[PDB]
Amino acid sequence: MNAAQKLGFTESTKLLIIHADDAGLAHAENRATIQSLQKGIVNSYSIMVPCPWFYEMAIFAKNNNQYDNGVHLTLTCEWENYRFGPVLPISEVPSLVDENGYFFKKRDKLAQNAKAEHVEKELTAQIERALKFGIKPTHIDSHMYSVGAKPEFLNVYRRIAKKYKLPLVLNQQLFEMVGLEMDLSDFKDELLIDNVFMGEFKYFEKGELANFYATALDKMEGGLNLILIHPAFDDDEMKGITINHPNFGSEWRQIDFDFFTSEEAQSKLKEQNIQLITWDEIREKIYKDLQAAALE
């Protein structure tokens, strides 16, 4: 059984979430995310609480409930010159940060250094800060999927998701990405994404990233599908953030914004009978199914 049936649809249904990550990271990213939601076919996004432009994104989110919004849990900071650290004070979560008090650049260093207790504390703090700013999140997911850097970290993530009664991103391709060879019979109580799509260097370098997105739309199969993008204007701010980091860098994010606000993308959606769904709808369906099961 694939996730589309577990949500009430036929097997053949091409469920899709087009999800913008890293909202709150930069002003250019906030503006491109908002525009892709307003006009594009992007239909969900998640927010990086520890980030310098989180506040602006929060003001947008608390007053624009119609757009499916979640918390982009952040434990790593990958950029050369633009560095951020935890919501909580360094002294409370010392194993999460480098000598400058910023998150590590790599999941490897994080998994080698971080204590599961510090991870639970800081992730809970990020969600609590979002809630106190008036955000009503519909899901939680993970920047660079650092929650998979250790099995204990993923268990903390699952436990936090159940505590807040929120859906979360769990998927087998993302598991293999982070080397987390966890079994599949542990996830009986969870909804697993059948297919996660994201851009790759090998297509970007050959000028074919837009082509990859087009083909991905063209050949989407039945089940729950998730497209992860990072729309942002390729301006001075993003060039400064992504210096020496072409992978998911500023030109890449520009390509994301262009393709997923393009009439080509909408035409491919309608051509293929791909049905968009939000995390909010998924949470409502799971809530009603559990309410119905518990009484009966």
Question: Could you say which residues in the range 167-206 bind a copy of itself, by CB under 8 A?
Answer: none
Binding-site partner at residue 100 among a copy of itself, Mn ion, none, CB < 5 to 8 Å by type = a copy of itself
By the 8 A CB rule, do 182 and 175 touch?
yes
Task: Measure the CA–CA gap between 61 and 256, rounded to whole angstroms.
Answer: 21
Judged by CB under 8 A, does residue 245 bind a copy of itself?
A: no
Binding-site partner at residue 143 among Mn ion, a copy of itself, none, CB < 5 to 8 Å by type = Mn ion
Binding-site partner at residue 22 among Mn ion, a copy of itself, none, CB < 5 to 8 Å by type = Mn ion
**Which of 109, 124, 133, 281 is close enough to bind a copy of itself by CB under 8 A?**
133
**Which of 3, 19, 21, 24 is close enough to bind Mn ion by CB under 5 A?**
21
Written as six digits, the tokens of 21 are 């990550």
Which range touches a copy of itself (CB under 8 A), out of 1-9, 63-71, 75-83, 272-280?
A: 75-83
Task: Measure the CA–CA gap between 234 and 287, rounded to whole angstroms.
Answer: 40
Task: Measure the CA–CA gap between 260 and 230, rounded to whole angstroms.
Answer: 10
- Cross-strand bridge partners of residue 142: 73
Task: Measure the CA–CA gap between 230 and 241, rounded to whole angstroms.
Answer: 14
**Which of 67, 82, 157, 212 is close enough to bind a copy of itself by CB under 8 A?**
82
Binding-site partner at residue 21 among a copy of itself, Mn ion, none, CB < 5 to 8 Å by type = Mn ion
Judged by CB under 8 A, does residue 213 bind a copy of itself?
A: no
By the 8 A CB rule, do 177 and 171 touch?
no
Q: What is the 3-state secondary structure (H, E, C) of 113-128?
A: HCCHHHHHHHHHHHHH
Distance of CA 292 to the CA centre of its chain: 30
User: Residues annotated in the binding site, as ranges?
Assistant: 22, 72, 143
Q: Which residues bind Mn ion (CB under 5 A)?
A: 21-22, 143
Q: Which residues bind a copy of itself (CB under 8 A)?
A: 27-28, 31, 52-53, 55-56, 59, 81-84, 89, 91, 100, 102, 133, 233, 235-237, 240-241
